[PDB]
Amino acid sequence: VTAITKVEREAVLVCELPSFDVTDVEFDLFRARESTDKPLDVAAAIAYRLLLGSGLPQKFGCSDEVLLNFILQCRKKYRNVPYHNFYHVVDVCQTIHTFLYRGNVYEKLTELECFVLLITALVHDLDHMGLNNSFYLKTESPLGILSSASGNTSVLEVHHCNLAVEILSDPESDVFDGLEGAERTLAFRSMIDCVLATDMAKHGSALEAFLASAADQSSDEAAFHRMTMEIILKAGDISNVTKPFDISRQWAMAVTEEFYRQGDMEKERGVEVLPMFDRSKNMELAKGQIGFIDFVAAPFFQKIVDACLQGMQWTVDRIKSNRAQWERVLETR
Numbered sequence: 184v185t186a187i188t189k190v191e192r193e194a195v196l197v198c199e200l201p202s203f204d205v206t207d208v209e210f211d212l213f214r215a216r217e218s219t220d221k222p223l224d225v226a227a228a229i230a231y232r233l234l235l236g237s238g239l240p241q242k243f244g245c246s247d248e249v250l251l252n253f254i255l256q257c258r259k260k261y262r263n264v265p266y267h268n269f270y271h272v273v274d275v276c277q278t279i280h281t282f283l284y285r286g287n288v289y290e291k292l293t294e295l296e297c298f299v300l301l302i303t304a305l306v307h308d309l310d311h312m313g314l315n316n317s318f319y320l321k322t323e324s325p326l327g328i329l330s331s332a333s334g335n336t337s338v339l340e341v342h343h344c345n346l347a348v349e350i351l352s353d354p355e356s357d358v359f360d361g362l363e364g365a366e367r368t369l370a371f372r373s374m375i376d377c378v379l380a381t382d383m384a385k386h387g388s389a390l391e392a393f394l395a396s397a398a399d400q401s402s403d404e405a406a407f408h409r410m411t412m413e414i415i416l417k418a419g420d421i422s423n424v425t426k427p428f429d430i431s432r433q434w435a436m437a438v439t440e441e442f443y444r445q446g447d448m449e450k451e452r453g454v455e456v457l458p459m460f461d462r463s464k465n466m467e468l469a470k471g472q473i474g475f476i477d478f479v480a481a482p483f484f485q486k487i488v489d490a491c492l493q494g495m496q497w498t499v500d501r502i503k504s505n506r507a508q509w510e511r512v513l514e515t516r
């Protein structure tokens with residue numbers, strides 16, 4: 184990868200984020216993006232401020248400059264797709280910050296693990312092309328073939344991990360360069376385990392494992408820490424419905440458009456299109472979100488809060504009010 188230039192860094196350091204509290208659960212990244220003519224710089228600046236403000240990079244020998252380099256190397260590898268772009272991973276970073284510090288999940292982890300989570304948020308979807316794992320397998324795409332051949336069906340997640348390892352292999356962008364021995368190993372393994380755990384095919388088993396570990400007073404500590412990390416990246420990854428309703432809605436619009444574009448390409452390639460990917464089925468956003476809330480997000484957040492993350496109660500509350508607002512959209516249609 185080409186080194187980050189001084190001009191690239193300055194363009195981020197310029198951004199001042201006047202009127203924004205990046206630590207707030209009601210922070211609005213869409214408003215931040217609209218605020219400016221250079222949304223990519225503002226997004227980078229948000230990530231930068233979150234990481235420096237945590238106090239964590241400083242404690243792990245990561246310089247302000249290596250941090251900004253890392254952020255900009257991550258940025259270069261996100262594509263202009265509707266949802267799985269740089270704004271999503273910055274959003275996940277910001278959201279995880281809130282979970283750690285507003286939800287007090289930081290209490291469950293070491294400072295290094297908190298640092299790893301914030302960093303992992305920015306790598307966890309590198310070079311996403313707007314197509315899910317299933318597309319690559321169904322179309323016998325080269326990436327799909329390689330996954331099947333090598334025995335790992337987490338097509339995209341292994342790819343993300345590959346590119347994270349590349350970025351971090353250069354000291355100029357290695358936010359873990361200040362680490363050695365077992366700390367450096369834990370950083371890489373936990374980062375990778377977390378990204379691998381974002382494959383929604385593993386959702387049920389990841390959740391089950393965490394819940395079982397959390398219920399067990401005699402769980403292995405290292406294992407509980409690792410599963411807590413996995414659950415928090417997962418939580419951030421499906422956190423759109425925990426946001427204030429107009430933020431939540433904009434996310435649903437973007438993901439819906441990404442799905443529809445995949446559906447279009449599936450049609451052209453003559454492979455199976457699921458209803459939720461099909462523009463012609465014309466399905467209402469309100470029912471989409473309610474279904475996601477009922478079948479995925481509300482059980483997830485409720486169970487982890489009840490089991491262990493009591494401080495993240497507000498996520499359950501916002502999901503509940505978001506569901507009620509979508510139901511009011513139905514009621515008045």
Ligand SMILES: COc1ccc(C2=NN(C(C)C)C(=O)[C@@H]3CC=CC[C@H]23)cc1C#CC(=O)NCc1ccccc1
Pocket residue numbers: 381383420421423424434435438459468470471472474475478479
């Ligand atoms: C902002 O809403 C969303 C935010 C995220 C996702 C994601 N879905 N999945 C899986 C669950 C299909 C992924 O694997 C994506 C990649 C990794 C993590 C989560 C991602 C879906 C929606 C939605 C919706 C929506 O209205 N459809 C209706 C729906 C109903 C039931 C279940 C899923 C969708």
Ligand SMILES: [Mg+2]
Pocket residue numbers: 307308339381
């Ligand atoms: Mg992903």
Ligand SMILES: [Zn+2]
Pocket residue numbers: 271275307308381420
């Ligand atoms: Zn993601």
